[PDB]
Design a protein around this ligand. Structure first.
Ligand SMILES: *[C@@H](COP(=O)(O)O)[C@@H](O)[C@H](O)[C@H](O)CS(=O)(=O)O
Ligand SMILES: *[C@@H](COP(=O)(O)O)[C@@H](O)[C@H](O)[C@H](O)CS(=O)(=O)O
Ligand SMILES: */C(=C/OP(=O)(O)O)CO
Ligand SMILES: */C(=C/OP(=O)(O)O)CO
Lengths: 292, 290, 291, 290
């Protein structure tokens, strides 16, 4: 008999999600180059930063998201993940194209779900790129195969729809695309929906709330906000507003650790600069869960 | 009919579970603490629902009985969203001057209905006696496991040792072992067991007794608090878990001391809750060593 | 002279969440009563006090230590968490009439400069109060104590404790607590450590009325002590006292009395006593936030 | 008219103090962040009072100016009861196209009146230049010390180095040392100093520079944040305190990043407060090593 993990296994005791992403791959290599690291940036620079981020920040997170390419095995072998923090393993295969590192994404066929479970993983995660002029059924079929990979192995399924401009045309409304992706994928049988924040978290709180309530109405599973595209200083308000609209927390990377890339004394910087940001987000999640 | 043990655990995988399903035994506790007799049913219901309301935020699951508090706790939204519900499925039969002389499966429990309303598990007390037929106990546990699993519920069994119907050859410590030899591989999802030696004495003796017990239980196991001083129960959880236990399913060591005090809800928050919180912390600390 | 201030012995909130382990022959009697081997050796008291300081001081804004059994040991062994201020007892307990503390004088063995050099921020003095003993003798002792503290840049904590009269059987404990506060509640000390009205028993409304009555007679910050209050009633006593104007607690028995005589002292202080002290600290912050 | 340094410290003995007394320098920061010019006085007052209200619970003391916020903060009870008040006593004189070209004692300060409101300290910026008279700076500091001490207030001095009036021989690092040689034993209670090397570069070189500075200050000393990236200020506090500093009296590294954002109060709580909280934690961690 299979004892599946449950969403409670990746939440704070409150039931809110306060989750850390360090699974960025070639996108993280480009961030090191942009911050002034010697090029070419060696794989070990990414591995060392990811494992240090997990070691120093995972005590503040209900779950951490790791990639097999650069850090899952290293984090497990080095006991970097706090025992209070669940492990999520990326199961997406990023395909570069058109001058960006993630132009297409397919399910990573190399992942051994039983083996990552034996190492302590509770969940897998799949980025789904959404475009108005690409076939919805191909996206749904990938999410169905992913759900089956997770559920047949007693793991949770986390999907992350991310909107992109159409392959052809200049008819792109990012705010409508986020809604349309949720109309398509918001009831797709995953355990958790990781979504972009409306309006990049910018502008009047009341307008962010209206936009977040509109999104909530199309998601029939628990949902959390991601930080890509949101200034680190606006992300705490984004979490408060999204949770007022019905979200259950956050799964964030850049808004926690991007600002320390290129500084001296990386471990001190992760403790003094990144950790207080992640701690505050956790406190906001508990405050919002207490109001239900 | 899918079910998972993870529906009643902390995120650590440890069990930090609260029992408030005590029936006539709880009425006798109120009388002993000086309550006006006869103690009305509403006094037990109000205490049970207050205990669930104030303490369930600190518990991975709470155990409720239909006689006095399941329906009331559900209807009054007393159970924290973070805490799973376990419903008792035991029918306590009094005899020989005690409230629980025999136990059968409670035919009044509607497993489909408690599943519909959000329950994750049922619980069955099994009285163990050396001179009563083992196969009758096993047949009751088999029927119970099927009632649970066919309805998508977990099965929690609670073997409790009693002296033989005839004879005076009664070693409580050997009986706990003998009950686990009999029932420890019975197909239930969780074994709720009495703590060896009432949690008293040297840690070395408690660890040896807990390791011995571990060897006979082929499912996750948790300790109950009956007979353990509330001040010794945290050490009992530490020792039992060092031996292989996965936590506790406890009532008395959490809330017995506030029966009879003024301001019951303040007392549950200030006296009982810190005890339950510490046990939860111990469970996570011990799970972190695996 | 840069004197300490009451904020130096409070939580960041300004509430007092302070631990007393300075009990002397009274603690030896507790060990005997709990079934320890008699006669109880001094090392049993020293070891328990240092273990209590080591395990519980992380949860306290200040800890109160006596030189007789544990101050030097706690300092030498770095038992006091860096987050927890040290208070040194400056009372000399005189036994009599079959009890360990029948009279109290200022302890002339205390070297205030030496305990300050060790990091002490405050001294503490028990004052026994009896209706048929001279008020001026008590006030003169409190004045000498305030001068010992303040001339050395230390805080002064006074602890009036009511006793039945030397002669007679007219003893109203609740009126005595009020009368002691009328006498000593404006005596120039920095903090008043007082017994809880009504032993913290009975209806909340009556406890609050009694605590408000007491508050009106104390013209310095005040905290409640736990002697006489059941450990299970002490959290409510702190809440009600603070609602009446108290600023917290300086408590021993309601934190650690229950573990005396148990096996595994260090585990019991961590698992039984620490959660009680943690909860009291949480209640102090909750009540300070309502100001 | 007693005073004690312990009126402005954490219980650890460290200083975790918030500056919101910036005057025309703050107006220039609002313009730089995209506010239309001229920026109204009310923009500065509202930001300062909000900063005191939301951040003073995390500070041992808060520094306020009479120009824009002292009276408003007092009238509105913006300063947490746990946070001491410091009042600026500097009169900034513009010149040469900058807001602070010269500084004299602010003759408008009524030391007894601000003490009656609860103030524990005054603060004076002293501009230091190698080719201006040292005795005039010492005389101003002595008059200030007497204003403070005679009225039961602490004296905080803030020497800030500037290039000489005439010449181009300016070594900022040597000037910081020379200012401390001049003023580091001037009878003030607290020295507020610029961080060597802007807090940049290798930790070992920052420590050596901070130790050199420490040797010339014969009173407790704290670092200010002007010139230090907000992300490097926590390391600067750690290194300065390793060298002998006792904490910080900082503004920009706490609240500069929220200037121009929507929802100022939420931003001060969610962005600025965690930075000030972390600095306070570092102060207690470094004091614990003494
Ligand atoms: C399990 C644990 O409770 P404790 O109070 O022993 O920790 C309960 O479910 C038991 O079945 C009851 O204690 C049985 S009874 O009502 O006492 O008879
Ligand atoms: C001291 C510390 O503030 P920081 O922002 O430098 O950390 C303040 O009191 C300074 O005097 C002001 O920064 C002066 S000014 O208004 O900028 O001219
Ligand atoms: C998911 C979120 O990371 P970020 O918040 O976008 O940087 C990464 O898989
Ligand atoms: C003051 C308080 O101790 P207790 O709470 O009365 O035991 C002892 O100096």
């Amino acid at each position: 008999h299979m004892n599946n993990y449950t969403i409670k296994d990746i939440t704070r005791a409150s039931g809110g999600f306060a989750m850390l992403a360090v699974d960025q791959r070639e996108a993280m290599r480009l961030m090191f180059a942009a911050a002034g690291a010697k090029t070419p940036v060696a794989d070990s620079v990414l591995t060392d930063f990811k494992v240090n981020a997990a070691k120093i920040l995972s005590p503040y997170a209900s779950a951490v998201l790791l990639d097999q390419q650069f850090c899952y095995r290293q984090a497990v072998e080095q006991n970097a993940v706090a025992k209070s923090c669940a492990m999520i393993v990326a199961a997406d295969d990023f395909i570069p194209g058109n001058g960006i590192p993630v132009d297409n994404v397919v399910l990573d066929k190399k992942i051994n779900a039983q083996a990552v479970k034996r190492d302590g993983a509770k969940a897998l995660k799949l980025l789904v790129l959404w475009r108005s002029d690409e076939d919805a059924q191909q996206r749904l079929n990938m999410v169905k195969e992913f759900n089956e990979l997770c559920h047949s192995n007693g793991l949770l399924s986390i999907i992350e729809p991310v909107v992109r401009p159409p392959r052809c045309g200049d008819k792109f409304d990012r705010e409508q695309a986020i809604i349309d992706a949720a109309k398509e994928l918001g009831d797709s049988g995953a355990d958790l929906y990781k979504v972009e924040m409306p309006l990049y978290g910018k502008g009047a709180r009341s307008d962010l709330l209206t936009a977040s309530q509109r999104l909530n109405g199309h998601i029939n599973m628990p949902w959390v906000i991601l930080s890509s595209g949101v200034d680190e200083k606006l992300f705490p308000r984004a979490v408060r507003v999204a949770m007022e609209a019905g979200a259950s927390g956050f799964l964030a990377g850049r808004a926690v650790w991007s600002s320390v890339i290129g500084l001296p004394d990386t471990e001190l910087m992760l403790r003094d600069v990144s950790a207080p940001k992640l701690q505050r987000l956790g406190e906001i999640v508990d405050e919002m869960m207490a109001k239900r």
